[PDB]
């Protein structure tokens with residue numbers, strides 16, 4: 001492919017021997033999740049993100065699938081793969097570094113970062129919808145749209161990441177994958193459709209408006225998607241749930257974003273808008 005093949009020794013060298021201590025303590029660990037750990041590295045005179053993968057053949061399939069999707073899909077709102085390593089004792093994927101990490105971490109202000117403004121949140125929602133539109137236009141279903149998989153660059157531009165479970169309505173699967181707090185009912189039953197990505201994006205829009213995680217075991221409701229029912233049954237208002245860590249949110253645009261989220265979250269897959277309609281509505285909002 002057009003990607004660089006890196007030596008495992010070069011990647012081990014540039015991540016301080018895959019130093020598992022967090023970056024805040026002087027180590028190289030930036031994150032963990034998606035079948036591996038992500039480390040900060042320095043190749044040539046550039047900061048990079050090195051994901052070290054850790055079923056053996058199931059992990060190799062995710063490695064191959066990510067490379068395949070990345071070779072085909074290049075867009076301003078998608079992460080960029082620079083290279084890979086498959087020669088040492090572990091599989092590695094090398095990406096262009098995202099200085100502002102994930103939307104999940106910026107919404108929680110992890111490591112003391114300042115709360116995102118409403119202006120920045122609108123740009124992020126638009127950017128993420130543009131990335132999903134590119135994936136759907138190129139006949140790919142992400143299957144794990146969530147705030148942890150929306151990364152933020154040096155200008156807080158939204159970049160969709162983690163295409164290891166992406167698939168090139170309609171199709172069924174015996175291996176149900178995804179993150180339960182973001183999954184559409186039909187996705188939880190094994191259906192594979194881009195309509196499920198829309199539902200997950202609706203949960204992301206609620207996270208952007210409220211600053212709350214999609215699931216919190218010590219919260220009522222535990223699942224963020226359940227606030228749609230509280231608002232519909234007039235028990236609460238969207239105003240009650242707006243993230244208090246903002247000083248520039250205006251009711252009109254917050255209600256406009258909530259209307260998009262509510263439409264995405266329709267329980268019936270055929271009643272949800274498609275990604276092009278979601279993009280149009282988010283563009284009209286600003």
Ligand SMILES: CC(C)(O)CCn1cc2cc(NC(=O)c3cccc(C(F)(F)F)n3)c(C(C)(C)O)cc2n1
Nearest residue numbers: 030031038049051079095097098099100101111161
């Ligand atoms: C406190 C601060 C200085 O504002 C933030 C520091 N920071 C910088 C990060 C970069 C990250 N990721 C990437 O650069 C990155 C880029 C492309 C792909 C991938 C992935 F697929 F492997 F996930 N990760 C992350 C994770 C690993 C979570 O995505 C967390 C970070 N935190």
